[PDB]
Design a protein around this ligand. Structure first.
Ligand SMILES: [Zn+2]
Length: 174
């Protein structure tokens, strides 16, 4: 396998959203300034799924698979919930640029790997249905939208990753 992924807190009780095929991988960040990857995985395990759910969390040098892939998700707050092959959240609790970069590198590699696994383009926020899409892009473009979320762009910017850099990294790898 390409990457070490901890599946110990993979929920087995989440609903399917839509039907196959799922044409998108979604890039998110948690919005939580303090939670670790384990805090997030623990909360995700116990939370009411109606409050939203996802497939992977990246943080503290680890990747935890917390929900199923290839099954849809309640991750983007609109019609593209039914296109979610995977939904990857980056933690927001980094104290240093070094900590951020350790996780950012895992995030890029994972997003690209999931797109490959799904047979989807390694492109970011394009006008095609298929590919990797940010929550911001889904908010701005999905049908039946009920979201205002713009992750992961504000958090990436906090630690010096621009819109253009994120696109370059997704499309080329690191
Ligand atoms: Zn999000």
């Amino acid at each position: 396998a390409s990457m070490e992924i901890n599946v110990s807190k993979l929920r087995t009780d989440l609903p399917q959203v839509g039907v196959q095929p799922y044409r998108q991988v979604h890039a998110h960040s948690t919005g939580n300034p303090h939670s670790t990857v384990q805090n997030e995985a623990d909360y995700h395990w116990r939370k009411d799924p109606e409050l939203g759910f996802f497939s992977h969390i990246v943080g503290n040098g680890a990747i935890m698979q917390v929900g199923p892939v290839d099954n849809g998700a309640w991750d983007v707050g609109g019609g593209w919930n039914a296109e979610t092959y995977a939904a990857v959240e980056l933690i927001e609790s980094h104290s240093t640029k070094e900590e951020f970069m350790t996780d950012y590198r895992l995030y890029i590699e994972l997003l690209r790997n999931l797109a490959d696994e799904a047979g989807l383009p390694k492109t970011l926020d394009t006008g095609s249905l298929a590919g990797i899409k940010t929550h911001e892009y889904a908010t701005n473009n999905q049908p039946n939208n009920h979201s205002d979320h713009v992750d992961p762009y504000p958090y990436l910017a906090k630690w010096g990753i621009s819109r253009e850099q994120f696109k370059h990294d997704i499309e080329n790898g690191l």
